[PDB]
Amino acid sequence: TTVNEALNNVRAQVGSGVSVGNGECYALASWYERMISPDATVGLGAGVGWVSGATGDTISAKNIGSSYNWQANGWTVSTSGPFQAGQIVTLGATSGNPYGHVVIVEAVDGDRLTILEQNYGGKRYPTRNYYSAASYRQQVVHYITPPARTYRETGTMSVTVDAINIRRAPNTSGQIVATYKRGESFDYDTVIIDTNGYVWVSYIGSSGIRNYVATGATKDGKRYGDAWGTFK
Ligand SMILES: [Cl-]
Ligand SMILES: [Cl-]
Ligand SMILES: [Cl-]
Ligand SMILES: [Cl-]
Ligand SMILES: [Cl-]
Ligand code: NA
Ligand code: NA
Numbered sequence: 001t002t003v004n005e006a007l008n009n010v011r012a013q014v015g016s017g018v019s020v021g022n023g024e025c026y027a028l029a030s031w032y033e034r035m036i037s038p039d040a041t042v043g044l045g046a047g048v049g050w051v052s053g054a055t056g057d058t059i060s061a062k063n064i065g066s067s068y069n070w071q072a073n074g075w076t077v078s079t080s081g082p083f084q085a086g087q088i089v090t091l092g093a094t095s096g097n098p099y100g101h102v103v104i105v106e107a108v109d110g111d112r113l114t115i116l117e118q119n120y121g122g123k124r125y126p127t128r129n130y131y132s133a134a135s136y137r138q139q140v141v142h143y144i145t146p147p148a149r150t151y152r153e154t155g156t157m158s159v160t161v162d163a164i165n166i167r168r169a170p171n172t173s174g175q176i177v178a179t180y181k182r183g184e185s186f187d188y189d190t191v192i193i194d195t196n197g198y199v200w201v202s203y204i205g206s207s208g209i210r211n212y213v214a215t216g217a218t219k220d221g222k223r224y225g226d227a228w229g230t231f232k
């Protein structure tokens, strides 16, 4: 899995309205890191930090750059930019939240940052927001720069999000064939569980080609957030 592929996976969370992991800002970053460094034994994604760097056995987003051993896994940390696609970025504390914030940089276009984040404005699900880099950099603490189980199952999925893309491959740049909308139901014959990625369901489509539908995030082989529909 490349940075681009992990990033594409986070992009595909946008619009789901469904929390990754426990809904905190750092759950999105943790999932993202895990996709890039799936075999790390220390770090945020691995759930092992310096006990000295935290208080009350709680995770504090503003301290994520100093509470976890990022360079153990080949990541680099800086207090200076510039912003780059693929970075994890931590932000200082403000009125209301003593723990600050953490996000993922999706893209940079001139002064425009495209930011992927969870639980920014009470919205405890992944969203895409735009910011001015000249403004945003003033709140940055750290810039953190990066370096499937399959089985048969005959089931029916009922979709409980606005829409899910249908794809020709089980990855998030497999280009859209169509979508399934909220409430709609469809049959599948195969389940694919990314160790760190998505639970996919799959079937052979009308034109004889196998199709794949993502149904929610996975981390370390288990669902990491609510499913995007119900199953029976
Ligand atoms: Cl320690
Ligand atoms: Cl360590
Ligand atoms: Cl701070
Ligand atoms: Cl289809
Ligand atoms: Cl096929
Ligand atoms: Na690794
Ligand atoms: Na998708």
Ligand code: NA
Binding pocket: 168, 169, 173, 174, 175
């Ligand atoms: Na494709």
